[PDB]
Design brief:
part of a larger assembly, 4 chains, A mainly alpha (about 110), B alpha+beta (about 60), C alpha/beta (about 150), D alpha/beta (about 210), B: about 60 residues, alpha+beta, two-stranded antiparallel ribbon, 2 strands, elongated, D: 4-stranded parallel β-sheet, two-stranded antiparallel sheet, about 30% helix, about 15% strand, RNA-binding, rRNA-binding (chain D)
Amino acid sequence: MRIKGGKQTRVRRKKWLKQASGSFGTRHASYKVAKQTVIQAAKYAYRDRRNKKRDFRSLWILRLNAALREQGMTYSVFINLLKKHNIEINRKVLSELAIKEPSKFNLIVQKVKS
Amino acid sequence: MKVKSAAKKRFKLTKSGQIKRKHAYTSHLAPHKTTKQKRHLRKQGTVSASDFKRIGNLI
Amino acid sequence: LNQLKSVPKARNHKTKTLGRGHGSGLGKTSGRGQKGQKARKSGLTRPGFEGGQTPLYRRLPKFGNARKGFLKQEWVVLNLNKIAKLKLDKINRASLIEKQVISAKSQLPIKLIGHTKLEKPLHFEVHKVSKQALKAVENANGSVKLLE
Amino acid sequence: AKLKLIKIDGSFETEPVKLSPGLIAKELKQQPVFDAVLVEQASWRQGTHSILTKGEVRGGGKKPYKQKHTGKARQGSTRNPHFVGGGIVFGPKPNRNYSLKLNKKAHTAALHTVWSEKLASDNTHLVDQNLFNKTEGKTKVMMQFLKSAKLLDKNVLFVVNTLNTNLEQSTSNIKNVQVKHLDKVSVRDLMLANALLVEKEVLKALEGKF
RNA sequence: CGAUAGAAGAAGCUGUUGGAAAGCAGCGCGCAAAAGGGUGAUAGCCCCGUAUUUGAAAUUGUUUUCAUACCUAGCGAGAUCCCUGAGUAGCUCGGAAAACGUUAUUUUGAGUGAAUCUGCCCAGACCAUUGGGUAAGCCUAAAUACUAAUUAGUGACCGAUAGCGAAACAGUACCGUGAGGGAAAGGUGAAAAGAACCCAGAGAUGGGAGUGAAAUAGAUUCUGAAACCAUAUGCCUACAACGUGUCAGAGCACAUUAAUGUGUGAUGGCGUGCGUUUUGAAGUAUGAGCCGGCGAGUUAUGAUAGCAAGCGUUAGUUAACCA
RNA sequence: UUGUGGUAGACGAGCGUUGUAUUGGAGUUGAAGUCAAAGCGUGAGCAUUGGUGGAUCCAAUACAAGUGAGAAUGCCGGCA
C-alpha cells in the first residue's frame, strides 16, 4: 500500500510560495527562504500595526502644536483649555485635519477664549 | 507477558488489591533491635499508594 | 443506517502523534523531554531497574510454601446466600452439572460454606461443611449427608 | 406484521398472511449493526501487501564512510530505509490479521433486528417455490419478471433453501440480482441490496432462529 | 475419474458531435454466457473468449472390483518341566539431557558389575506395602513442516525514485588481481500513416510542403513542474551606510475573480535570519547552496487505564476443530 | 463573569490525500495533471477562470494508512 504525497507537497509549497513576491532578486525563488521572509514580514507588519497608532497621535501633536505655538500657546495650554471648561471630543487627528479645513482653526481659537 | 518469578515469591494478593508484602531486617542480631520492633516487624503490610504505581506495572 | 450515512456514536477516540508536525505540536520526542536516556529510541527502565538502586525483590525476604511440589485439591464452595438464588432442590452431583455450577466433564469435592440463614428445607450431598454453615442448614430443616 | 405474497403475474396475491409480533424488533440498536456490517467487511484481506525491513533487504557489508574525515553523514550501514535500496522501516506485512472478535449475542440481536426491518421495509415481496417451476434458465424471462416487479432500482437478493435450479441458472448474466442461502446472508448484504424476495417456507425457521 | 492435442458456443440499426463513437440519445433483441481482453475515446449484441455442451490415438497419474502370491487364527486340559532380548540393569569418578545451573529418571569417557520373571523397573532421595508393566531386537502409511516448479485464478499488492539488483538482452555494464561488491533507463502515433516535394547549407540542421484530426504527436516523438538560462512591455536605480523588508507614499502605465484595483516606487518612520542544543545566540557555537521526489512512532501477542456496547447475577465467552 | 504570554507537557475538537464499499454526476461538446490571474476561508483547505492537456475523475459516508516534509555534516537526481 504505497502512498505517494508528491502532488500534495508540490501544491502545498506552491500555495506557500504564492504569498511571496516582489522580493530582491532570487529571494522570491527558494521555498525555504521565502517561508522565512513571509513569516518575518508578517511579524513586522503586526508590529507596525501595533505601533502606528502609537506614533500617529504624537505626529498629530507635532502638527497641531506647530500651529498652536505659531499663535503663542503650547499644546499643553490647548489640552488644559479643553480639560477644564467646554470639554470636547474632537480628536487630535480631526483637530489636526481642521488645518486642512480653511477658515476653521480661527473658529476654534476664538471659541476657546475664556 | 509473564509474571516475574523473583517478585511473585515475596508478595501475596488479597481481596480488592492490597498486595501483602514482607518485613526485612530479621537476619542477624536481636540486641540491635527493641522489643516493640521485634514484635511489630512480624506483622506484614501493604505497599503504599506511591509504591502502588511501582507495583502494578511490575506485574 | 446506510453506507452513505454510517456514523459512530462515541468511537474514534483521540490519538497521539509522535513524529509528525510541529504547528499542531507533538513532532519531537512527544512526552520524553530532551536529553534523556528515556528520550532515546527504545529508552526505558527495566521493571527491576531503579536507576542504580537495588531492586525491591532483593531487599525483602521471600515467602516459604509448605505446599511445594504439592497441588492443593480445589473445592467448589456452596455459600447459602449465593445458592439462595439457585432454584435447585434435592441437590446432587447429577443436578449440579445440569445447571453448570460445575463443569459436566469434571468432578470436584464439594464444600458447604456460609452462615446466611435460608427458609427452605432441601437435601444436601456435600463432602465438606463449615460448623456455622452446618448449623445454618440443619436449623433450616434441610437434610445434609456428608459424602466421601 | 403482515405482507402479501407476490405472483409471477407481477401483482400481489389477494391472500395476506399474518406474522407474529415476536419477530418485529422493539429495541433498535444500529451501532451493533454497524459493527456487524464492519466485521462482514472485515476479514476480507488477502495478505498481498508486504515490505522489507532493515535486515530483510540484501546487500553487501560495505561502510559508505569511515569514522572521520567525511563531510557528510556517517552512513555506517550499506542499506537504510532512506537509501535508494528501498524498504519501509515499518510498512505493511503479510501477518497483520486485523480481525476483530465479535460476540454472537449482540450480533444475533442486531441480525434479528435488521431482518425485522428488512421484512417490514416494504422492499420485500413474498414469493414461493411454485412460480419458478416451468421456468428455464433463460435470463429473458427473469428480466421480464423483474421489469414487471420493477425491482431493478436496487440489488435483488434471492434467499434460497430448496435450491431451485432455474434461480442459479440466472442472476449471473445480470448485475443487480444474486442468490445466497438463508444463513449465508448478512446485515451488510441486506442493507446493500435493499431489495429481495423471500420464499414462504423459511419464515418459521427464521423466526425460530430469531 | 483424469492430465499431457482440441471443438462448438446467443443477441443492432438509426442519428449525433467527433479524424475515428463502441461513448451519447431513440427505437429493438438477447441468454446456463452483459467474467475478461482486443477492436480508432470504456461495445452485452464487431471479434476472440466466457458460462455451458464437448473431446485424448500414444504417454502418464488416481480410485474401485475381480483371479491370486505373502502374512496372520480359537477353545480346553497336565506341570515347583525349559525360556522370554548381560559388559544389560546397575554402584562410583566427571558429565549432559531433562523447566531443572546435575536432583528423582535417562545416556556414558574411566573403573566395577547383578537377577532370570519366584525377578526387575518405575510411582522426582530412599525404605516397606501396594499399583502397574517385564526393558536390555526391529518396522510402521494417517494427521506433520516445506514449496524449486507446473496448471488455473485472485490480490481494501507495488505501478519505472517503488516493486526481485534487474519491465529495459541484469548479476549485464563496471571495480578491486581476487575471494567479493555491484549500474541507470518504459510509454510517437490510430495506422510510420517516419516528415514525400522545394530552399539555404558539403552534410548534419533548419525552414516552408505533405501524410496525418492534430507534427502543443517529428523519432530529445503521452504531458513537460521545480531549480537554472536568457528576453523584452512598463517603472525605478550611478551622494550611496538597509538580514534588503514593513507601515506609508509622489509620480508613472494600466484596467481585475470591478473591487477604497493592479504593477512600481523619489522619499519618511520602523526594523541585527530558520531549525539546533544550552541558563541562553543576529552570533566570531553547529548544520543548511538551492531545487524535485523520497525520508524516520507500525505490527503480532498479552496486560492495564478511559469511553461505548452486549449480556448481566453462574452469566459472558469459547481455545482448538469442523461446515 | 473570567477571559483568549507560553516551552516542556496535558487535554479537546477538526481538515487534506489514496484505496475498498455502497447511493450520484461529469467527461473528444475535454477528465486529471501542469503552469498563470487582480477569490473564499480562524487554518488544516476550498475554489473560479484562461489556455497546455488528451482520457480520467470529483462530490457525500465509514473502514485501513509505504498518510500529511524545514533542515537529520539527511538518499538520489538537476542546477548554478
